[PDB]
Design a protein around this nucleic acid. Structure first.
Ligand code: ADP
Ligand code: FLU
Lengths: 38, 620
DNA sequence: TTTT
C-alpha cells in the first residue's frame, strides 16, 4: 500500500493545485506522477 | 483485533469529552450526545471514543461530501484498521415515479459508479472478516441489501491443501455472481489458465487472488497485483464473498414468479371490482412482461421492485440493511444529528409516497412497497449505543440523552465570535461600511438574507458598487458551491450572500464577519439552531464577529446570543489560564464568454492539460 | 441534500 499511498497523495495534491489555479505546480506534479507510473 | 489510533493529542476539553463518552458507553447508555461547538475537533474526539470502546462502529452522515470528508479523515486516523465507505453507487439516478396531474411516466434512469460499488462490497465483506471496522455511511445504510446470513453463507472459503477440483471451484464462483472473463479481467470476474484460477474480489480493483491447483488440491493461495502479476503475499486462507449483495437462486426464483402471479391475480380482481379498468390493463401488461423476462432471463429491469418476492419473505417484512451486517454489539455515531436524524426518518415516508401513487395507478404491485428503506422504529431497533454529534442537538437527541457532553475548546484557542445587534434601519448602509472595512483587511464576509428578493437586490447593489460578490442561489449544487467557496477563499469574491449559509463547506477561516439580516424574524432561518450554526461560520478566525440586524430580541436570538457568550467566556477563561494565544488555522457579452472559457479551463484541468488551463486562466 |  505504501507506494500507492504516496501516489494517491500526490494525486490529491495535484487536483488541489488545479483548483487553486496553481497550474504551474499541478504540471510539475503531473510530470512527476508520470515518471513513477513508468 | 484492537483499533490503533494514529498527529494530535487531546487538547482543550477533549480529554474530558472522551472520558464521559466512553464512561457513558461503559455504563451502557444507549443515547449520548457530544455537544461540540463547530471547529472543536469533533471527528477526533469520536475517533478517541472508537479506540477505547473497541466496537465496530457505524458513522452516519447527511451528505456524501461530508461522508467522504470523514472517510478521508478516518483512513488517516486508523491506517491499520478497516475504514470503509458505504454510500450509494448511483452516480446519477432519476427515480421512477408518476405524475397524475399530467399522465406522464418517469422511466428509472441511472449510472452505476464502479468505484463506489466496490467500496460497498469492501464494507459488507469487512464486517465478516474482522472486528476493527469503521464504516462511514449515508442513509444508504437503512436501505435494502440481501440477507447477511445468506451472504455470509454463500461465501466460498479457500484454504491451502484443501481438496477441490478446479471446475468445481468455478461452479461455486458463478452461483455467487462471479463472471468468467479471460480478456477483460476486472473486479467481479475470474480468469483461468490451466491450474491457476484468478479471482478479482468484488471489493478490490487492484489486488486479486490466485489459486494454484495440482490435481484436486489447492496448492497455494497468493495475493497478486492484477494489471502486473506481481506477488504481494501468500495466504493459507481466503474468503471470497458474493460479487453482488442480492443473488436469487433459480429455485427461489421459480416460486417467486408463482407468488407474483397470485398477488397479481388478486390485485386485478380488486381493481376490476372497483372499476379501475385502465389501471388494471397496465398493471397486468407490465407485470406480465416483467414475468416473461424473469422466466427467460431471471432478470428484468426494475427487478428490485420484486425484491421481497425473491426473498420468499412474508409481506411488511423489514428489509435487510447494512445495520444487519454488524455484530449485535456495535456503536453508531451520527454526525450532525440535528440534520441527519430528520433525514433518516424522512426516508421511509418519502419513499412510500412515490410508490403509492405508482401502485394506485397500477405501475407496480403492492408488494413493491416492501422494497423500502427502514422506518425509524426499525432503525431504533439497531441502536445498541448511539452518539449524536451536533452544536445544536435536535429534539429526539435531547429527549433521549440524560446529560449532554459539551465540547467547546478549540485546539488553537480560537474564540466564539462577538455579536453586535443593531437596528433594521440603516441596515444596508451600516453593512456596506462593515464590508468596505473588511475588504481593506484582506478578509471575507458572509451575509444571510431571508429571501430570494433581498439577496438578489443586495447582490446587485454590491456589484453596482465595485465590490466582488456572489449570490448562493438555493438551486446551486454542492459541486458548484465548492468552486464558489474556493473562489471566496482565494479572493475572487469578497462577499457571499445567501439564504442558507448552513449549506455544506461554508466553514472558512478567511471569513472575519457574518451579517445576519432580519434576525428577529424567527421562522426556520432565524431559529436558535440556524442562528447558532450561522454564528458558527464566524469562529474560524481570530477576529470573527457577527452583526445581527434586528429591531427586537427574540427567544431564538436570546438563546443563540447567550450560548455564544457563555462559550466565548469559558474559552477565554481557559485561554488565559493556559497561556494560549488565539491564532487562525489556515457586460452581457463578457459574462457569457467568461463562463465558456471557465468551462474550457475546468475541462483542461480534468484532462490534466494544465498548460492549456493556464492559457485560459491568464485569458480570464 | 438523500435515496431506489
Ligand atoms: N487534538 C487536536 N490537536 C490539534 N489539532 C486538532 C485536534 N483535534 C482537531 N484538530 C484540528 O483542528 C481543526 C478543528 O477540527 P474540526 O474537524 O473542524 O472540528 P469540527 O468537526 O468540530 O468542525 C481541524 O482542522 C482538526 O483537524
Ligand atoms: C472522491 C470520490 C469521487 C467519486 C466517487 O465515486 C467516489 C469518491 O470517493 C471518495 C472518497 C474520499 O475519501 C475522498 C474523495 C472521494
Amino acid at each position: 500500500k505504501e507506494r500507492q499511498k504516496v501516489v494517491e497523495q500526490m494525486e490529491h495534491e495535484m487536483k488541489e493545485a488545479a483548483k487553486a489555479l496553481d497550474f504551474e505546480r499541478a504540471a510539475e506534479l503531473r510530470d512527476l506522477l508520470l515518471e513513477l507510473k513508468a | 483485533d484492537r483499533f490503533e489510533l494514529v498527529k494530535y493529542q487531546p487538547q482543550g476539553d477533549q480529554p474530558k469529552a472522551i472520558e464521559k463518552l466512553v464512561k457513558g458507553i461503559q455504563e451502557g447508555k444507549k443515547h449520548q450526545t457530544l455537544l461540540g461547538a463547530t471547529g472543536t475537533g469533533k471527528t477526533f474526539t469520536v475517533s478517541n471514543l472508537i479506540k477505547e470502546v473497541n466496537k465496530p462502529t457505524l458513522v452516519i452522515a447527511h451528505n456524501k461530501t461530508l461522508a467522504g470528508q470523514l472517510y478521508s479523515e478516518f483512513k488517516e486516523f486508523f491506517p491499520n484498521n478497516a475504514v470503509e465507505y458505504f454510500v450509494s453507487y448511483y452516480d446519477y439516478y432519476q427515480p421512477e415515479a408518476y405524475v397524475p396531474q399530467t399522465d406522464t411516466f418517469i422511466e428509472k434512469d441511472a449510472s452505476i459508479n464502479d468505484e463506489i460499488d466496490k467500496l460497498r462490497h469492501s464494507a459488507t465483506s469487512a464486517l465478516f472478516e474482522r472486528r476493527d471496522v469503521i464504516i462511514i455511511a449515508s442513509v444508504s445504510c437503512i436501505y435494502g441489501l440481501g440477507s447477511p446470513e445468506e451472504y455470509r453463507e454463500m461465501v466460498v472459503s479457500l484454504r491451502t491443501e484443501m481438496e477441490i477440483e478446479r471446475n468445481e471451484l468455478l461452479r461455486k464462483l458463478v452461483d455467487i455472481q462471479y463472471a468468467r472473463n479471460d480478456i477483460d479481467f476486472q473486479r467481479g470476474t475470474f480468469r483461468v489458465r490451466g491450474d491457476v484460477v484468478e479471482i478479482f474480489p468484488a471489493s478490490r480493483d487492484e489486488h486479486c487472488v490466485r489459486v494454484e491447483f495440482f490435481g484436486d488440491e489447492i496448492e497455494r493461495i497468493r495475493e497478486v497485483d492484477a494489471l502486473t502479476g506481481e506477488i504481494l503475499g501468500d495466504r493459507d486462507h481466503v474468503a471470497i464473498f458474493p460479487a453482488s449483495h442480492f443473488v436469487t437462486r433459480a429455485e427461489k426464483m421459480e416460486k417467486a414468479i408463482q407468488n407474483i402471479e397470485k398477488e397479481l391475480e388478486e390485485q386485478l380482481k380488486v381493481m376490476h371490482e372497483n372499476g379501475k379498468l385502465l389501471e388494471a390493463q397496465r398493471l397486468e401488461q407490465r407485470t406480465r412482461y416483467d414475468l416473461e423476462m424473469m422466466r427467460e432471463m431471471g432478470f428484468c429491469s426494475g427487478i428490485e421492485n420484486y425484491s421481497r418476492h425473491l426473498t420468499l419473505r412474508p409481506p411488511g417484512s423489514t428489509p435487510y440493511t447494512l445495520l444487519d451486517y454488524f455484530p449485535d454489539d456495535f456503536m453508531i455515531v451520527v454526525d450532525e444529528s440535528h440534520v441527519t436524524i430528520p433525514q433518516v426518518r424522512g426516508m421511509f415516508n418519502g419513499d412510500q409516497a412515490r410508490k403509492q401513487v405508482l401502485v394506485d395507478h397500477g405501475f407496480r404491485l403492492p408488494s413493491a412497497l416492501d422494497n423500502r428503506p427502514l422506518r425509524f422504529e426499525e432503525f431504533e431497533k439497531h441502536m445498541h449505543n448511539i452518539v449524536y454529534v451536533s452544536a445544536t442537538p435536535g429534539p429526539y437527541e435531547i429527549e433521549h440523552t440524560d446529560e449532554m457532553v459539551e465540547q467547546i475548546i478549540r485546539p488553537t484557542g480560537l474564540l466564539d465570535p462577538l455579536i453586535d445587534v443593531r437596528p433594521i434601519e440603516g441596515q444596508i448602509d451600516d453593512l456596506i461600511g462593515e464590508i468596505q472595512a473588511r475588504i481593506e483587511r484582506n478578509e471575507r464576509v458572509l451575509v444571510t438574507t431571508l429571501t430570494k428578493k433581498m439577496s438578489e437586490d443586495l447582490t446587485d447593489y454590491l456589484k453596482e458598487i465595485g465590490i466582488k460578490v456572489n449570490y448562493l442561489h438555493s438551486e446551486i449544487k454542492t459541486l458548484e458551491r465548492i468552486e464558489i467557496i474556493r473562489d471566496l477563499r482565494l479572493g475572487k469574491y469578497d462577499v457571499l450572500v445567501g439564504i442558507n449559509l448552513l449549506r455544506e463547506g461554508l466553514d472558512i477561516p478567511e471569513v472575519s464577519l457574518v451579517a445576519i439580516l432580519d434576525a428577529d424574524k424567527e421562522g426556520f432561518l432565524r431559529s436558535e439552531r440556524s442562528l447558532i450554526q450561522t454564528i458558527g461560520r464566524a469562529a474560524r478566525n481570530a477576529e470573527g464577529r457577527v452583526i445581527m440586524y434586528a429591531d427586537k430580541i427574540t427567544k431564538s436570538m436570546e438563546i443563540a446570543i447567550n450560548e455564544t457568550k457563555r462559550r466565548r467566556e469559558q474559552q477565554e477563561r481557559f485561554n488565559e489560564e493556559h497561556g494560549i494565544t488565539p491564532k487562525t488555522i489556515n457586460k452581457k457579452e463578457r459574462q457569457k464568454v467568461v463562463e465558456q472559457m471557465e468551462h474550457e479551463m475546468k475541462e483542461a484541468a480534468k484532462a490534466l492539460d494544465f498548460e492549456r488551463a493556464a492559457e485560459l486562466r491568464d485569458l480570464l
